[PDB]
Amino acid sequence: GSFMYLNELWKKKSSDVMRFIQRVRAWEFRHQHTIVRLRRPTRPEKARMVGYKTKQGYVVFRVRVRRGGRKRPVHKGITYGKPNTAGVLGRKLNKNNRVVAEQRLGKKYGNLRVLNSYWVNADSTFLWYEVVAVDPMHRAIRRDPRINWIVNAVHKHREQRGLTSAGRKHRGLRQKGHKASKLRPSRRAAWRRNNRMVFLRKR
Amino acid sequence: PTRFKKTRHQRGSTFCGYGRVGKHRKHPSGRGNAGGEHHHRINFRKYHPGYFGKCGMNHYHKKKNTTWKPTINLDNLTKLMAKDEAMKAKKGEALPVIDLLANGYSKLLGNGHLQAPCIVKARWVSKLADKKIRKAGGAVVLQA
């Protein structure tokens, strides 16, 4: 169908025509706000793959995040203690930038439920993602059996607890079997299991 | 029980068996296995001569289930049969059949004097076990 042509065209990102389109868009995004609301997604086929459904209640935002590694927030760049814990510039954050974009949107607008996100553009300073959200109070959302699970209170701020696709990635949940034995339910759940002291009644 | 301890005998002795000169202090020689090469060298060398150092090749992902191989000797084969069967069969008669896998054994070693002839099913067998059971009037049937 038509999806096939759009999907394969987006795999040629380093082509002359594609690089021209992205260069113009990146200039345009550079002169906008950190969070901007869109009428329609930039990539309709990528949005529908991750949950967007062009109905009443689905919204799309574009979020901007800064690039580079994390700098430790210590006074004057001075650390104390053992030299093993030194260094203010060379360490990195343990969360990826896709999940930082989702958390920045959800924290600002508390009446929405964040669904998913995807990559849109990048340059030397900024990176752009588009986040799909749903509101839970709308009648169209509440009566649709394929999306009305998100109305339940157990899914409030699910992006702040690392329950989205980007959150599952940095938690190690893409792996299974012998590659994820020490973190499968959760990293803290496995640590409790292996470190608690057990006293049987008739030991 | 607390009433059987030495603490009950030491009520009124003021030192509890630790002396006036060198008292009871906390860790006068270090914690755990500290100084095993410096000030505890004689104790380690005398009683644990192989503690320090390396030896041999490594083996990642051991999986101990692949090397399961219990052994039983020809001298203990009677314990796997019924009491009457031990004396019922001899040489040219019908012999009892022993299956080692059901009883939890893999290899048949031949040690000692065989009591009664029999037919044994096993995964592995020895040179001596094969020769001794054949002379006595039995046989070995290989299993898997």
Binding site: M4, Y5, E8, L9, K12, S14, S15, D16, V17, M18 | R123, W124, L142, Q143, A144
Partner: protein, 98 residues
């Protein structure tokens, strides 16, 4: 029934003979079949967008006749050597066609 087993441990067919049903056809074997529709769509798109700067460098190396240097360049860009050999075959065939 493929390769009936012997009755013993060790010996190129380890033991406990059974009857060894062949297999189930399953549905994941279509992953190994050719994808004609997927190939045709990619042919249209590659026609539209043209060539990438990485492919231009490889094509200029193959024109001179430095096939080993082309593979070394592709391996650094693409990672594995299996991917590098695939890319060189694709650029070479496109040159031959045109």
């Amino acid at each position: 029934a493929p390769v009936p087993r012997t009755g013993i441990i060790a010996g190129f067919n380890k033991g406990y003979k059974t009857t060894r049903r062949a297999r189930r056809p399953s549905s994941n074997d279509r992953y190994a079949l050719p994808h004609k529709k997927l190939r045709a769509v990619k042919a249209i798109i590659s026609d539209l967008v043209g060539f990438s700067p990485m492919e231009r460098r490889v094509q200029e190396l193959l024109r001179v006749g430095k096939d080993k240097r082309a593979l070394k360049f592709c391996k650094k860009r693409l990672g594995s050597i299996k991917a590098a050999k695939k890319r060189r075959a694709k650029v070479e065939e496109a040159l031959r066609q045109q």
